[PDB]
Coordinates of C-alpha atoms and ligand atoms in Angstrom, one line a residue:
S387 CA 93.4 90.4 65.0
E388 CA 95.3 90.4 68.4
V389 CA 96.4 94.1 68.5
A390 CA 92.7 95.2 68.2
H391 CA 91.5 92.7 70.9
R392 CA 94.1 94.0 73.4
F393 CA 93.5 97.7 72.5
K394 CA 89.7 97.2 72.9
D395 CA 89.9 95.2 76.2
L396 CA 92.6 97.5 77.8
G397 CA 91.6 100.8 76.3
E398 CA 93.7 103.7 74.8
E399 CA 95.1 105.0 78.2
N400 CA 96.3 101.5 79.4
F401 CA 97.3 100.1 76.0
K402 CA 99.6 103.2 75.5
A403 CA 101.0 102.7 79.0
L404 CA 101.6 98.9 78.6
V405 CA 103.3 99.2 75.2
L406 CA 105.6 101.9 76.7
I407 CA 106.5 99.8 79.8
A408 CA 107.2 96.9 77.3
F409 CA 109.5 99.2 75.2
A410 CA 111.4 100.7 78.2
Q411 CA 111.9 97.2 79.7
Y412 CA 113.5 95.8 76.6
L413 CA 115.6 98.7 75.4
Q414 CA 116.4 100.1 78.8
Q415 CA 119.3 102.1 77.5
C416 CA 117.3 103.8 74.6
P417 CA 116.3 107.4 75.4
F418 CA 112.7 108.5 76.3
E419 CA 111.8 110.1 72.9
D420 CA 112.9 107.0 70.9
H421 CA 110.3 105.1 73.0
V422 CA 107.7 107.9 72.6
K423 CA 107.9 107.6 68.8
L424 CA 107.5 103.8 69.0
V425 CA 104.5 104.1 71.4
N426 CA 102.7 106.6 69.0
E427 CA 103.4 104.2 66.0
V428 CA 101.8 101.0 67.7
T429 CA 98.9 103.1 69.1
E430 CA 98.3 104.7 65.6
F431 CA 98.5 101.2 64.0
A432 CA 96.2 99.6 66.7
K433 CA 93.6 102.3 66.0
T434 CA 93.6 101.1 62.3
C435 CA 92.8 97.6 63.6
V436 CA 90.2 98.9 66.1
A437 CA 88.6 100.8 63.1
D438 CA 88.9 97.8 60.7
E439 CA 90.2 94.4 61.8
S440 CA 90.0 93.6 58.1
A441 CA 93.3 95.7 57.6
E442 CA 96.6 94.1 56.6
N443 CA 99.3 93.5 59.4
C444 CA 96.5 93.9 62.0
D445 CA 96.2 90.0 61.8
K446 CA 99.9 89.6 63.0
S447 CA 100.8 88.4 66.6
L448 CA 101.9 91.0 69.3
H449 CA 105.2 89.0 69.6
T450 CA 105.9 89.4 65.8
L451 CA 104.7 93.1 65.7
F452 CA 106.6 94.7 68.8
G453 CA 109.7 92.8 67.7
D454 CA 109.7 94.6 64.3
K455 CA 109.2 98.2 65.8
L456 CA 112.6 97.9 67.8
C457 CA 114.5 97.0 64.6
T458 CA 113.4 100.2 62.7
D459 CA 122.0 90.8 67.3
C460 CA 118.4 89.9 68.4
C461 CA 116.8 91.8 65.6
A462 CA 118.6 89.6 63.0
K463 CA 116.8 86.5 64.5
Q464 CA 113.1 85.7 63.8
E465 CA 110.2 84.3 65.9
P466 CA 110.5 82.2 68.2
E467 CA 114.3 82.9 68.3
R468 CA 113.3 86.7 68.4
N469 CA 111.5 87.2 71.7
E470 CA 113.8 84.9 73.7
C471 CA 116.8 87.0 72.7
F472 CA 115.3 90.4 73.9
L473 CA 114.4 88.5 77.1
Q474 CA 118.0 87.2 77.6
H475 CA 119.1 90.8 77.0
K476 CA 117.1 92.4 79.9
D477 CA 119.4 93.9 82.6
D478 CA 118.7 93.7 86.3
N479 CA 121.6 96.1 87.0
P480 CA 121.3 98.6 84.0
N481 CA 124.2 101.2 83.7
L482 CA 121.9 104.3 83.9
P483 CA 122.4 107.6 85.9
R484 CA 121.2 107.9 89.5
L485 CA 117.7 109.4 89.1
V486 CA 117.7 112.8 91.1
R487 CA 114.5 114.4 92.4
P488 CA 113.9 118.0 91.2
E489 CA 112.6 120.8 93.6
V490 CA 108.9 120.5 94.4
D491 CA 108.0 123.7 92.4
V492 CA 110.0 122.2 89.4
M493 CA 108.1 118.9 89.7
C494 CA 104.7 120.6 89.9
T495 CA 105.5 122.9 86.9
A496 CA 106.3 119.9 84.5
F497 CA 103.1 118.0 85.8
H498 CA 100.8 121.1 85.2
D499 CA 102.6 122.0 81.8
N500 CA 102.1 118.5 80.5
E501 CA 100.4 115.6 82.4
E502 CA 100.8 112.7 79.9
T503 CA 104.6 113.3 79.2
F504 CA 105.2 113.6 83.0
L505 CA 103.6 110.2 83.6
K506 CA 105.1 108.6 80.4
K507 CA 108.5 109.8 81.8
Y508 CA 107.6 108.1 85.2
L509 CA 106.6 104.9 83.5
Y510 CA 109.7 105.0 81.3
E511 CA 112.3 105.6 84.1
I512 CA 110.7 103.0 86.4
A513 CA 110.3 100.2 83.7
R514 CA 113.8 100.9 82.3
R515 CA 115.5 100.4 85.7
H516 CA 113.1 97.6 86.7
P517 CA 112.8 95.3 83.6
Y518 CA 110.6 92.7 85.4
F519 CA 108.1 95.2 87.1
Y520 CA 104.7 93.7 87.1
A521 CA 103.3 95.8 84.2
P522 CA 99.5 95.9 85.4
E523 CA 100.7 97.0 88.9
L524 CA 102.9 99.7 87.3
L525 CA 99.7 101.3 85.8
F526 CA 98.3 101.3 89.5
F527 CA 101.6 103.1 90.7
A528 CA 101.1 105.7 87.8
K529 CA 97.4 106.2 88.9
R530 CA 98.6 107.0 92.5
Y531 CA 101.6 109.1 91.2
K532 CA 99.1 111.3 89.1
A533 CA 96.6 111.3 92.1
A534 CA 99.3 112.6 94.5
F535 CA 100.4 115.4 92.1
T536 CA 96.7 116.6 91.6
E537 CA 96.4 117.2 95.4
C538 CA 99.8 118.4 96.4
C539 CA 100.6 120.9 93.5
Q540 CA 97.3 122.8 94.3
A541 CA 97.8 122.7 98.2
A542 CA 99.7 125.4 100.3
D543 CA 102.7 123.3 101.3
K544 CA 103.3 121.5 98.0
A545 CA 106.5 119.9 99.5
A546 CA 105.5 118.4 102.9
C547 CA 102.3 117.0 101.1
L548 CA 104.0 115.2 98.1
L549 CA 107.5 114.2 99.3
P550 CA 106.1 111.7 101.9
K551 CA 103.7 110.3 99.2
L552 CA 106.7 110.0 96.8
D553 CA 108.7 108.3 99.5
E554 CA 105.8 105.9 100.2
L555 CA 105.3 105.0 96.5
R556 CA 109.0 104.5 95.7
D557 CA 109.5 102.2 98.8
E558 CA 106.3 100.3 97.7
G559 CA 107.5 99.9 94.1
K560 CA 111.0 98.8 95.1
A561 CA 109.2 96.1 97.1
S562 CA 106.8 95.2 94.2
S563 CA 109.7 95.0 91.8
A564 CA 111.6 92.6 94.1
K565 CA 108.5 90.4 94.8
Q566 CA 107.7 90.1 91.0
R567 CA 111.4 89.5 90.2
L568 CA 111.2 86.4 92.4
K569 CA 108.0 85.2 90.6
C570 CA 109.8 85.4 87.2
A571 CA 113.0 83.9 88.7
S572 CA 110.9 81.0 90.0
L573 CA 109.2 80.5 86.6
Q574 CA 112.3 80.8 84.4
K575 CA 115.1 79.2 86.6
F576 CA 112.8 76.5 88.3
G577 CA 109.8 75.9 86.1
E578 CA 106.0 76.1 86.1
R579 CA 105.7 73.4 88.8
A580 CA 107.9 75.4 91.2
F581 CA 105.7 78.5 90.8
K582 CA 102.4 76.4 90.9
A583 CA 103.5 75.0 94.2
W584 CA 104.4 78.4 95.7
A585 CA 100.9 79.8 94.6
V586 CA 99.1 76.7 95.9
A587 CA 100.7 77.2 99.3
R588 CA 99.9 81.0 99.4
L589 CA 96.4 80.9 98.1
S590 CA 95.7 77.9 100.5
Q591 CA 96.8 80.1 103.4
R592 CA 94.9 83.2 102.1
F593 CA 91.7 81.2 101.1
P594 CA 91.5 78.3 103.7
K595 CA 87.7 78.1 103.2
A596 CA 88.2 77.4 99.5
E597 CA 88.4 73.8 98.2
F598 CA 91.5 72.3 96.6
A599 CA 89.8 72.2 93.2
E600 CA 89.0 76.0 93.6
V601 CA 92.6 76.8 94.7
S602 CA 93.8 74.8 91.6
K603 CA 91.7 76.8 89.1
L604 CA 93.1 80.1 90.5
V605 CA 96.8 78.9 90.5
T606 CA 96.4 77.7 86.9
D607 CA 95.1 81.2 85.9
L608 CA 97.7 83.0 88.0
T609 CA 100.5 80.9 86.5
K610 CA 99.2 81.9 83.1
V611 CA 99.0 85.6 84.2
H612 CA 102.6 85.7 85.6
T613 CA 104.2 83.5 82.8
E614 CA 102.9 86.1 80.3
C615 CA 104.3 89.2 82.1
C616 CA 107.7 87.4 82.7
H617 CA 107.8 86.4 79.0
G618 CA 107.0 90.0 78.0
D619 CA 103.3 89.4 76.9
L620 CA 102.2 92.5 79.0
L621 CA 99.0 93.2 77.0
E622 CA 97.5 89.7 77.5
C623 CA 99.1 89.7 81.1
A624 CA 97.1 92.8 82.1
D625 CA 94.0 91.4 80.4
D626 CA 94.1 87.8 82.0
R627 CA 94.8 89.5 85.4
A628 CA 91.6 91.5 84.9
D629 CA 89.8 88.3 83.8
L630 CA 90.9 86.6 87.1
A631 CA 89.9 89.6 89.3
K632 CA 86.4 89.4 87.7
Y633 CA 86.1 85.6 88.2
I634 CA 87.3 85.7 91.9
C635 CA 84.7 88.6 92.6
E636 CA 81.9 86.6 91.0
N637 CA 82.7 83.4 92.9
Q638 CA 83.6 85.1 96.2
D639 CA 81.5 82.6 98.4
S640 CA 83.6 79.7 97.1
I641 CA 87.0 81.5 97.7
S642 CA 87.0 84.2 100.7
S643 CA 85.1 86.5 103.1
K644 CA 87.9 89.1 103.0
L645 CA 87.1 90.0 99.4
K646 CA 83.8 92.0 99.6
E647 CA 85.7 95.4 99.8
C648 CA 88.2 94.7 96.9
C649 CA 85.5 93.7 94.4
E650 CA 83.6 97.1 94.8
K651 CA 86.9 99.0 93.9
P652 CA 88.1 100.3 90.4
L653 CA 89.9 97.6 88.2
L654 CA 93.5 98.8 89.1
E655 CA 92.7 99.1 93.0
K656 CA 90.7 95.8 92.8
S657 CA 93.6 93.4 91.7
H658 CA 96.0 95.3 94.0
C659 CA 93.6 94.5 96.9
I660 CA 93.1 90.8 96.0
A661 CA 96.9 90.4 95.4
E662 CA 97.6 91.3 99.1
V663 CA 94.3 90.4 100.9
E664 CA 94.4 89.3 104.5
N665 CA 94.0 85.5 105.0
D666 CA 90.4 84.5 105.6
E667 CA 89.1 82.7 108.8
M668 CA 90.6 79.2 108.9
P669 CA 87.7 76.6 108.9
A670 CA 86.4 75.6 112.3
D671 CA 86.1 71.8 111.8
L672 CA 89.4 70.7 110.2
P673 CA 90.5 67.1 110.5
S674 CA 94.0 66.0 111.6
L675 CA 96.5 65.8 108.7
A676 CA 97.4 62.3 109.9
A677 CA 94.0 61.0 108.9
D678 CA 94.8 61.3 105.2
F679 CA 98.6 61.5 105.0
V680 CA 100.0 59.2 107.7
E681 CA 97.2 56.9 109.1
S682 CA 95.1 56.3 105.9
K683 CA 95.7 52.8 104.4
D684 CA 95.7 54.5 100.9
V685 CA 98.8 56.9 101.3
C686 CA 101.3 55.0 99.0
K687 CA 98.4 54.1 96.6
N688 CA 97.4 57.8 96.3
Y689 CA 101.1 58.7 96.0
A690 CA 101.4 56.2 93.1
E691 CA 98.0 56.7 91.4
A692 CA 98.2 60.6 91.5
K693 CA 101.5 61.9 92.9
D694 CA 100.8 65.5 91.7
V695 CA 97.2 65.6 93.0
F696 CA 98.0 63.9 96.4
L697 CA 101.2 65.9 97.1
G698 CA 99.3 69.0 95.9
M699 CA 96.5 68.2 98.4
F700 CA 99.1 67.7 101.2
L701 CA 100.7 71.2 100.5
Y702 CA 97.2 72.7 100.4
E703 CA 96.1 70.9 103.6
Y704 CA 99.2 71.9 105.6
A705 CA 99.2 75.5 104.2
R706 CA 95.4 76.1 104.7
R707 CA 95.9 75.4 108.4
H708 CA 99.4 77.1 108.7
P709 CA 99.3 80.9 108.1
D710 CA 102.1 81.3 110.7
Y711 CA 104.4 79.2 108.5
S712 CA 106.3 80.9 105.6
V713 CA 105.7 79.5 102.1
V714 CA 109.4 78.4 101.8
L715 CA 108.8 76.3 105.0
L716 CA 105.6 74.8 103.7
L717 CA 107.4 73.8 100.5
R718 CA 110.4 72.3 102.5
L719 CA 107.7 70.3 104.4
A720 CA 105.8 69.2 101.2
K721 CA 109.1 68.2 99.5
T722 CA 110.1 66.3 102.7
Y723 CA 106.7 64.5 102.7
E724 CA 107.2 63.3 99.1
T725 CA 110.8 62.3 99.9
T726 CA 109.8 60.2 102.9
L727 CA 107.0 58.7 100.7
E728 CA 109.6 57.8 98.0
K729 CA 111.6 55.7 100.5
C730 CA 108.8 54.2 102.6
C731 CA 106.5 53.1 99.7
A732 CA 109.3 50.7 98.6
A733 CA 109.9 49.3 102.2
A734 CA 108.2 46.0 103.5
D735 CA 105.8 48.1 105.7
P736 CA 105.5 51.7 104.7
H737 CA 103.1 52.7 107.5
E738 CA 105.7 52.2 110.2
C739 CA 108.4 53.8 108.0
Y740 CA 106.5 57.2 107.4
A741 CA 104.6 56.9 110.8
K742 CA 106.8 59.6 112.5
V743 CA 107.2 61.8 109.4
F744 CA 105.7 64.9 111.3
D745 CA 108.6 64.4 113.8
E746 CA 111.0 64.6 110.8
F747 CA 109.5 68.1 110.2
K748 CA 110.2 69.2 113.9
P749 CA 113.7 70.7 113.2
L750 CA 112.6 72.4 109.8
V751 CA 110.0 74.4 111.7
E752 CA 112.2 75.3 114.7
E753 CA 115.2 76.6 112.7
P754 CA 113.2 79.6 111.1
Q755 CA 111.6 80.3 114.6
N756 CA 115.1 80.4 116.1
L757 CA 116.5 82.8 113.4
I758 CA 113.5 85.3 113.5
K759 CA 113.7 85.6 117.4
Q760 CA 117.6 86.0 117.4
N761 CA 117.6 88.7 114.6
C762 CA 114.7 90.6 116.1
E763 CA 116.3 90.9 119.6
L764 CA 119.4 92.3 117.8
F765 CA 117.0 94.6 116.0
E766 CA 115.4 96.1 119.2
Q767 CA 119.0 96.7 120.4
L768 CA 120.7 98.1 117.2
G769 CA 117.6 100.0 115.6
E770 CA 118.2 99.1 111.8
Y771 CA 121.4 100.8 110.5
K772 CA 123.7 98.9 112.9
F773 CA 121.6 95.8 112.2
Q774 CA 122.5 96.1 108.5
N775 CA 126.1 96.5 109.5
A776 CA 126.0 93.2 111.4
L777 CA 124.4 91.4 108.4
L778 CA 126.9 93.3 106.2
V779 CA 130.0 91.8 108.0
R780 CA 128.3 88.3 108.2
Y781 CA 127.5 88.1 104.5
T782 CA 130.8 89.8 103.4
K783 CA 132.6 87.0 105.4
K784 CA 130.6 84.2 103.8
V785 CA 130.7 85.4 100.1
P786 CA 133.6 88.1 99.8
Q787 CA 133.9 87.7 96.0
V788 CA 130.6 89.7 95.6
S789 CA 131.0 93.4 94.5
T790 CA 130.8 95.9 97.3
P791 CA 127.7 97.7 95.7
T792 CA 125.8 94.3 95.6
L793 CA 126.9 93.5 99.1
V794 CA 125.9 97.0 100.4
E795 CA 122.5 96.9 98.4
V796 CA 121.6 93.4 99.6
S797 CA 122.8 93.7 103.2
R798 CA 120.8 97.0 103.6
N799 CA 117.8 95.2 102.1
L800 CA 118.3 92.2 104.4
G801 CA 118.6 94.6 107.4
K802 CA 115.1 96.1 106.5
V803 CA 113.6 92.8 107.8
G804 CA 113.7 94.1 111.4
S805 CA 111.4 97.2 110.9
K806 CA 109.3 95.3 108.4
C807 CA 108.7 92.2 110.5
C808 CA 109.7 92.5 114.2
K809 CA 106.6 94.8 114.6
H810 CA 104.1 91.9 114.2
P811 CA 103.0 89.6 117.1
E812 CA 105.7 86.8 117.5
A813 CA 103.4 84.2 115.5
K814 CA 103.1 86.5 112.4
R815 CA 106.9 87.1 112.2
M816 CA 108.1 84.0 110.3
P817 CA 106.0 84.3 107.0
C818 CA 106.9 88.1 107.0
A819 CA 110.7 87.4 107.6
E820 CA 111.3 84.3 105.5
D821 CA 109.1 85.2 102.7
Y822 CA 110.8 88.7 102.7
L823 CA 114.4 87.2 102.9
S824 CA 113.7 85.0 99.9
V825 CA 112.8 88.1 97.9
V826 CA 116.1 89.8 99.1
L827 CA 118.2 86.7 98.5
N828 CA 116.6 86.4 95.0
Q829 CA 118.0 89.9 94.3
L830 CA 121.5 88.8 95.4
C831 CA 120.9 85.8 93.0
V832 CA 119.8 87.9 90.0
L833 CA 122.5 90.6 90.5
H834 CA 125.2 87.8 90.7
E835 CA 123.8 85.9 87.7
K836 CA 124.9 88.8 85.5
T837 CA 128.6 88.7 86.6
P838 CA 129.3 85.4 88.6
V839 CA 132.2 85.7 91.0
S840 CA 131.2 83.6 94.1
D841 CA 130.7 79.8 93.4
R842 CA 129.0 79.7 96.9
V843 CA 126.4 82.3 95.7
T844 CA 125.9 80.3 92.4
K845 CA 125.5 76.9 94.4
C846 CA 122.9 78.3 96.8
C847 CA 121.1 80.3 94.1
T848 CA 120.9 77.5 91.4
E849 CA 120.5 74.5 93.8
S850 CA 117.0 75.3 95.0
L851 CA 114.6 78.3 95.2
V852 CA 113.0 77.2 98.6
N853 CA 116.3 76.1 100.4
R854 CA 118.1 79.4 99.5
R855 CA 117.9 81.0 103.1
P856 CA 119.1 77.9 105.0
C857 CA 121.8 77.6 102.3
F858 CA 123.2 81.1 102.9
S859 CA 122.6 80.9 106.7
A860 CA 124.7 77.7 106.7
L861 CA 127.8 79.4 105.2
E862 CA 130.8 80.0 107.4
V863 CA 133.6 82.5 106.7
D864 CA 135.5 82.0 103.4
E865 CA 138.9 80.6 104.4
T866 CA 140.0 80.0 100.7
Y867 CA 139.4 83.7 99.7
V868 CA 142.6 85.8 99.0
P869 CA 142.3 89.0 101.0
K870 CA 142.5 92.2 98.8
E871 CA 145.1 94.8 99.5
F872 CA 144.8 98.5 100.4
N873 CA 146.2 101.4 98.2
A874 CA 145.9 105.1 97.4
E875 CA 142.8 104.3 95.2
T876 CA 140.9 101.8 97.5
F877 CA 139.3 104.8 99.3
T878 CA 138.6 108.2 97.7
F879 CA 138.0 111.1 100.2
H880 CA 136.8 114.6 99.1
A881 CA 135.2 117.6 100.8
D882 CA 131.6 116.6 99.6
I883 CA 131.5 113.8 102.2
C884 CA 130.9 116.5 104.9
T885 CA 127.6 117.7 103.4
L886 CA 126.2 114.3 102.7
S887 CA 122.6 113.1 103.1
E888 CA 122.1 110.8 106.1
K889 CA 121.3 107.9 103.7
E890 CA 124.5 108.5 101.6
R891 CA 126.6 108.8 104.8
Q892 CA 125.4 105.4 105.9
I893 CA 125.9 103.8 102.4
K894 CA 129.5 105.4 102.3
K895 CA 130.2 104.1 105.9
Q896 CA 128.9 100.6 105.0
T897 CA 130.9 100.5 101.7
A898 CA 134.1 101.0 103.8
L899 CA 133.1 98.2 106.1
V900 CA 132.7 95.7 103.3
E901 CA 136.2 96.7 102.0
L902 CA 137.6 96.5 105.5
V903 CA 136.3 92.8 105.7
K904 CA 137.6 92.1 102.2
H905 CA 141.0 93.1 103.6
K906 CA 140.8 90.7 106.6
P907 CA 137.9 88.2 106.4
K908 CA 138.9 86.6 109.8
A909 CA 138.6 90.2 111.4
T910 CA 136.5 90.6 114.7
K911 CA 133.7 93.2 115.3
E912 CA 136.1 95.1 117.7
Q913 CA 139.1 95.0 115.3
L914 CA 136.7 96.3 112.5
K915 CA 135.1 98.9 114.9
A916 CA 138.7 100.2 115.8
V917 CA 139.5 100.8 112.1
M918 CA 136.0 102.2 111.5
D919 CA 136.6 104.6 114.5
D920 CA 139.9 106.0 113.2
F921 CA 138.1 106.5 109.7
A922 CA 135.3 108.5 111.5
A923 CA 137.8 110.7 113.5
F924 CA 139.5 111.3 110.1
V925 CA 136.5 112.8 108.2
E926 CA 135.5 114.7 111.4
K927 CA 139.1 116.2 111.4
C928 CA 139.1 117.1 107.6
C929 CA 135.5 118.3 107.5
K930 CA 136.3 120.9 110.3
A931 CA 139.8 121.6 108.9
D932 CA 141.0 124.9 107.4
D933 CA 142.1 123.3 104.1
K934 CA 140.0 120.0 103.8
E935 CA 141.6 118.6 100.6
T936 CA 145.1 118.7 102.1
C937 CA 143.9 117.0 105.3
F938 CA 141.9 114.4 103.2
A939 CA 145.0 113.7 101.1
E940 CA 147.8 114.0 103.8
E941 CA 145.8 112.2 106.6
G942 CA 144.2 109.9 104.0
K943 CA 147.7 108.3 103.3
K944 CA 148.3 107.9 107.1
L945 CA 144.7 106.4 107.6
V946 CA 145.1 103.6 104.9
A947 CA 148.7 103.1 106.2
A948 CA 147.5 102.7 109.8
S949 CA 144.5 100.5 108.7
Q950 CA 146.8 98.1 106.8
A951 CA 149.2 97.3 109.7
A952 CA 146.4 97.3 112.4
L953 CA 142.9 96.0 112.8
Ligands
LIG919 O1 94.9 90.4 90.1 C1 95.6 90.0 91.0 O2 96.8 90.7 91.3 C2 95.3 88.8 91.9 C3 96.3 88.2 92.6 C4 96.2 86.9 93.1 N1 97.1 86.2 93.9 N2 98.2 86.8 94.1 C5 99.3 86.1 94.6 C6 99.4 84.7 94.9 C7 100.6 84.3 95.4 C8 101.7 85.2 95.6 S1 103.2 84.6 96.1 O3 104.2 85.7 96.2 O4 103.0 83.8 97.3 N3 103.7 83.6 94.9 C9 105.0 83.4 94.3 C10 105.2 82.5 93.3 C11 106.6 82.2 93.0 C12 107.6 82.9 93.6 C13 107.3 83.8 94.6 N4 106.0 84.1 95.0 C14 101.5 86.5 95.4 C15 100.3 87.0 94.9 C16 95.0 86.3 92.9 C17 94.0 86.9 92.2 C18 94.1 88.1 91.7 O5 93.0 88.7 91.0
LIG920 O1 129.3 100.3 112.2 C1 129.1 99.2 112.7 O2 127.9 98.8 113.0 C2 130.2 98.2 113.0 C3 129.9 96.8 113.1 C4 130.9 95.9 113.0 N1 130.5 94.5 113.1 N2 131.4 93.6 113.1 C5 130.9 92.2 113.0 C6 131.9 91.2 113.1 C7 131.5 89.9 113.0 C8 130.1 89.6 113.0 S1 129.6 87.9 113.0 O3 130.0 87.3 111.7 O4 130.0 87.3 114.2 N3 127.9 88.0 113.0 C9 127.1 88.4 114.0 C10 125.7 88.6 113.9 C11 125.0 89.0 115.0 C12 125.6 89.2 116.2 C13 127.0 89.1 116.2 N4 127.7 88.7 115.2 C14 129.2 90.6 112.9 C15 129.6 91.9 112.9 C16 132.2 96.2 112.9 C17 132.5 97.6 112.7 C18 131.6 98.6 112.8 O5 131.9 99.9 112.6
LIG921 O1 132.4 109.1 109.4 C1 132.4 108.9 108.2 O2 131.9 109.7 107.3 C2 133.0 107.6 107.6 C3 133.2 107.6 106.3 C4 133.9 106.5 105.7 N1 133.9 106.6 104.3 N2 134.3 105.5 103.7 C5 134.4 105.6 102.3 C6 134.3 106.8 101.6 C7 134.5 106.8 100.2 C8 134.7 105.6 99.6 S1 134.7 105.5 97.8 O3 133.4 105.3 97.4 O4 135.5 106.7 97.4 N3 135.6 104.2 97.5 C9 135.2 102.9 97.0 C10 133.9 102.6 96.5 C11 133.6 101.3 96.3 C12 134.6 100.3 96.5 C13 135.8 100.7 97.0 N4 136.1 102.0 97.3 C14 134.8 104.4 100.3 C15 134.6 104.4 101.7 C16 134.4 105.5 106.5 C17 134.2 105.6 107.9 C18 133.5 106.6 108.5 O5 133.4 106.6 109.8

């Protein structure tokens, strides 16, 4: 009796929350009350399984049960053809209104008037926009959301208290959503082995005192935990995630010294802590990697007798002594190793063939170090917004088939690497940057997957997970792309532009830049600035003007006319 097991282990509050997240992630377009009725039904039913497991239908699988509730094209099909359909029907870019924040008094009224509904609405709106949000982490976001409203709605300045907390949590969730999106992407588009490897590299860096067999047990469980959430099995996902947090905390002395605090925290806070713990102290006495991977007379034999274990050991051994290296780098190195081993172990004398394999790594390590430095110097100069604009023009030139909204979202997100990473001491910058850029390029990948337009995005996206950043970095301007033309409807200028929020002013200014590039992909920073200058002088003119709409319309014609025959 599955439904009872999960209701018992997770408890009423969490079960009700998980089931809702599941419903809002599948039927993203269905309204809040349609999900509320569905939640009440499964919760009512689960209670009649919790009271008596001996009841009918209580013995059915969660996959079979939840599937039914939605049906009250994918609904026609039955298990296993059932769940795969609803999965394939999840939307990374769902056509939903732009969620607007009400006034603080308004927000505090609704929370006081009804707490549960207020949080069910939060869980609903998030999950429906973010179909791959790590469900257990989402309960932690709700916990904090509730906890912020309890303190700020009773305080004197309800606004200045909550708004920064709301800004901190929404930035944190957008980041959580994007990291978890990459996890699912790695599992579904690349396979269990690609995810296994990624986790082996990270947990090796984070737990360098832990033995390979111990890093293996964790990754096996973490692969289970994440496959489940990505597949939609949110109830067992949240359970197995709690079952791993318990194991880690029991066997701390075999895993890490940075765990003591996390394990004394409540169950939601505990897993959140472990998921992002600081890497432990690297072991003092660590032999050279050459001893086992280059010099050892048994390399090829170990590569033949156990390719998965030996190559797994190499990844673990490099990663456990390289926390200044991004996981994508460590995986490029591990792949390179295996690749050189494939060649050399066929040759007459393999030892001389693969003898200078660590010298074959030398470029692969330098290239990210070169990128991070370059992009951070530009960051200290430009400050962020102008840094996004630089990336904007660069990426628009490489892949101009991509929609302006996707280019503006992604280039803004790429730009955010400077503030996020150039703050750390030079040595800590590469995992931050590269491991963050993979998350942002994964977004460009998932948004493009829905409506493929650029064959270059498709190639870099599908070709590899790990080589994605060098794949885009390597792209030059598109010389085969047919420049788009300007008209009366390219740009739309109204009075409202004047009173825009700073954020929306930037986004509007960036949106025009992408289009300007889409007009002339061979355009130069100065040519683009010249047109961007005239555009600025134009809204300055009409926003100050007596009429506004007549300036915006009259001068609007002249602006697009002057922008066409001059760069
Ligand atoms: O409960 C938890 O959240 C918890 C989390 C744990 N490990 N968390 C990890 C481990 C690895 C990563 S990772 O981001 O490097 N891995 C991946 C995998 C594929 C694609 C992208 N990233 C991220 C989180 C380990 C034990 C736990 O208890
Ligand atoms: O608002 C702005 O920041 C602004 C920025 C503009 N940037 N134009 C360009 C043009 C070309 C490039 S690029 O492809 O050469 N890439 C780069 C990247 C870093 C430094 C220099 N160039 C990068 C930026 C052009 C017009 C503007 O209005
Ligand atoms: O100073 C400014 O406010 C400023 C504003 C500018 N506004 N650019 C805009 C304003 C509105 C739009 S729009 O959203 O109506 N048009 C669109 C939207 C998407 C794709 C193509 N066109 C597109 C570009 C452009 C340059 C500037 O300097």
